[model samples]
Target chain A: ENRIQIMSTIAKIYRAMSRELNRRLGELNLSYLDFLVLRATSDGPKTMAYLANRYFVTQSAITASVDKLEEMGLVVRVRDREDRRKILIEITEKGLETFNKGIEIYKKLANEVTGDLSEDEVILVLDKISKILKRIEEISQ
Target chain B: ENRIQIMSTIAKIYRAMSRELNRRLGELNLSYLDFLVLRATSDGPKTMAYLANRYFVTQSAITASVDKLEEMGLVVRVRDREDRRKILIEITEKGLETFNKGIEIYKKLANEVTGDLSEDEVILVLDKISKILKRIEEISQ
Candidate 1:
């Protein structure tokens, strides 16, 4: 019963959060899936294969996202100098700006969603989340 | 830093969980969204407008999902007896079977993800999730 309750609650929250996030992204003319790709590449250049592996999505998914980003002039594809056969995705300046905006909006929404939780409660939540994430990693492998 | 880490971790887990659920549903030739519609109607009959409100999605979104479910013979739409203009969705026998199977897979995966947690840890998680869900409800309102 506890598991069922927890799962149902989680699903509800996921739906609400995703809907809000999608609305925010829609205003920016972006998709949540594309946001993931941009967020992943925000740090530095990454290969399509690397993204596919990291996100547990297909290469085509990554490629499609990258294609959209490129069309928006938010990202560019460049050949890896060290390996001519390899290509890498590089987030443009505009891409970084968009990514940062996305993060800001996300943080604002997340803060509002968890606003009721005190610092102590968050620490406790983090502890539980850390354990569950470790379990998720094990299962993913 | 804490918020960022928390959001990042939550996003990671959500992606992993969603991918797995989508796979399970895909095996049955159903989509994750349609599965939600089926799960929602599993309790009893619900109107399209009610589902849209409950799921925080637009009527078109709910309609699209119902369209698929109806096509697959998982659910059927009928006019409400008291309010003929209002359409209600009822899950078919096949939908109930799929819903149960989906729950079985979900439980197995959820348990695996949270199995390592002690009773106290789960209690802590439940408390934290409750607060967050409450905040989400407030913001949604």
Candidate 2:
């Protein structure tokens, strides 16, 4: 029962978070995948391989997602100077603006969900989650 | 940085779990969604509305998922004897076998990821996750 409860809770949280964020992103005509790709590229240029690895998706899927973002003029693809065969992904100015706005909304939602907890409680939760994450990584490897 | 780390960890775990489950399910020509619906119905009869609420998806999406299952002969829909307007979903024998197999794989994966934790550690993790789940529910409401 405990295992089932844990699994169910994870599913519920994932769905709830996805619904909330996608609903907000919908207003900006962005899907959750689009928001992810945009936010990922905001800090610095990333390789398609990086995005694919990060998302645990296929290279083709990343290409398709980047293609759509490029079509929207929110991102661009550039040939890597060092590795001409590799492509780099960069967020455009408009993409950054959209990402910033979307990120604000996302953070607000996250805060709303987590804000009720005391500082210590928040730290405890983060600590526990971090440990679980380490376990997952170990199992994956 | 904190928010990004939290969000990144969540995405990473979600992707890893999803990839693991979907890969196993693919061998049986099933998806994670299919496994979920199958597992939910294995207990007994369920209504589309109940599933929709449980999965945090629209009734239409649940209907479509059920449609696929029904077409595959894994489930059957019946009129509710108690509530004339309500439709009850029941899993077929094949569905039960498939769910049993699928759930074993799922549990194995979950155990592999979490089994390293001591009883006290598991309890702490569950407690922390439960609080977060409550917060998400509060915000959603």
Candidate 3:
């Protein structure tokens, strides 16, 4: 029973994080997926198929989300100048601004989360969770 | 940078564990949700509404999963003889066996995940994570 709760609570903790993020992101009209898409496109243009694969979502779902971002003026879908057939997702200046603000929220929240803990305490937890995360990734393949 | 990765990694680790669970649970012809439902009904009969609320899933979605469970002969949905209007989910003998086995997988995985850490290291990590989890629970409510 103790071991079960030990493993299960990690799942529960992450879920609570999602709920907190969703509740907070809702205020900025930015869903968690929307923020993730922005981060994916921050560096350069990415195709719909690439985003879909990286996020493990369907192409249609990514397209629909991109469409929403385009409408909100956070991102734009444009034909690549060098290759007309290929459409690239590009972030607008306002999009970058919005993304940065969103990032600030993330930074602030992380600070708030670890604020009470000492540096050693923080590292202790990170190393433990990090160990499991690394193991799962290794075997998941 | 570290702070952001701190919280983000927590989310990623749980996601990895989910993938791990799904991959392993597939061999038993059980999805993660199926195992959770079995655990939920392990003690006694639980109503579909109660399960839906507990799992944070829609009533229809829970019903569909329960339907699959029934088809597998792992659980049975029967009218409460004392309360004819209500349907309750009851675990079968086979279901109990499967649930126990599923639990074994969880226990084994947790041990493996922490296998490399010393006892002091293990407690250090759990205590750190436990603090954050408790804080999140307190704030989330």
Candidate 4:
């Protein structure tokens, strides 16, 4: 029953947050995946495979996000100078601004949501959630 | 940084679990909403309005889930005995079995995931998550 209670709350929180996030991001004209890919570009140029592997998704998943980023003029496709066949996605000026704005929203909202919890408590919960996520990933596969 | 890390893990866990759950429930021929509605019926017959409010969704959403439940023969809709105009969704024999199986799976998986954590630790994490959820709801509104 304790486990059930814990999972029940987890489920509720997840569902509510997921819905809220999509609605909020809609204002930015980006899907969750598109926003994620946009953020990844901040780490310098990346291949679609890199983004896919880092996010534990398929190459096809990243391709669509990259496509949208390009369409939105947020990112550009470039070929490696030394190896022209090696393609990398690079963020444009507008993409950087958009990504930075998204990061601001993410951090601000996260801080607000966790304001009442002490830093130590938040860290502890983060650890707990990470462990749980690892277990979930195991089961998910 | 702490808050960002917390939300990141929370998002990952939610997405992974949401996908895994739907796939697992597919084997039982139920959507997440269907499973939830079926569980609610265990508390006895409930009106569509009751389910909608309880789940924080619109009545239209509950209607589809109920429609699926009725089609699957796991539940039946009947007029309230005391108020003929009032309708309620009641679980059938197979519904009980199906819900029982779902509970078994739910409890088994939750316990397995948290086997290393003490009961108190689990309770503490649950409390922290609920607090964060409340804060999020405030902003989300």
Question: Residue A10 in candidate 4 has what lDDT?
Answer: 74
Best by lDDT: 4
Candidate No. with top TM-score: 3
TM-score of chain A of 4: 0.75
- Candidate 2: segments with Cα more than 4 A from true spot: A56-64, A81-85, A137-141, B1-4, B27-29, B49-53, B56-64, B80-86
What lDDT does each candidate get? Answer: 0.80, 0.77, 0.78, 0.81
The sequence of per-residue lDDT tens digits that candidate 4 reaches over residues A61-136 is 8988898889999999999789999899999999999988888778877888888899899988888877887887
List CA RMSD, all candidates. Answer: 3.1, 3.3, 2.9, 4.2
> How should the candidates be ordered by lDDT, best one leading?
4, 1, 3, 2
Q: Cα miss at B116, model 4 (Å)? A: 3.0
lDDT of 2 by residue, B10-94 (tens): 6567776777788788887788878889988999889888888777768888888899899988999988678777788899999
Better of 1 and 2 by TM-score: 1
Regions of candidate 3 where Cα sits further than 4 Å from its true position: A1-5, A47-50, A85-88, A111-116, B78-82
Window of ten residues with lowest summed lDDT in model 3 chain A: A1-10
Q: Which is the winner by TM-score between candidate 1 and candidate 3?
A: 3
**TM per prediction:** 0.82, 0.82, 0.83, 0.77
Model 4 clash pairs? none
Best by DockQ: 3
Say what the RMSD of model 3 is: 2.9
Per-residue CA lDDT of model 3 for A16-41, tens digit only, reads 66667767777879887788788888
In model 1, state the lDDT of residue B108: 84
Error of 4 at B69 (Å): 2.2
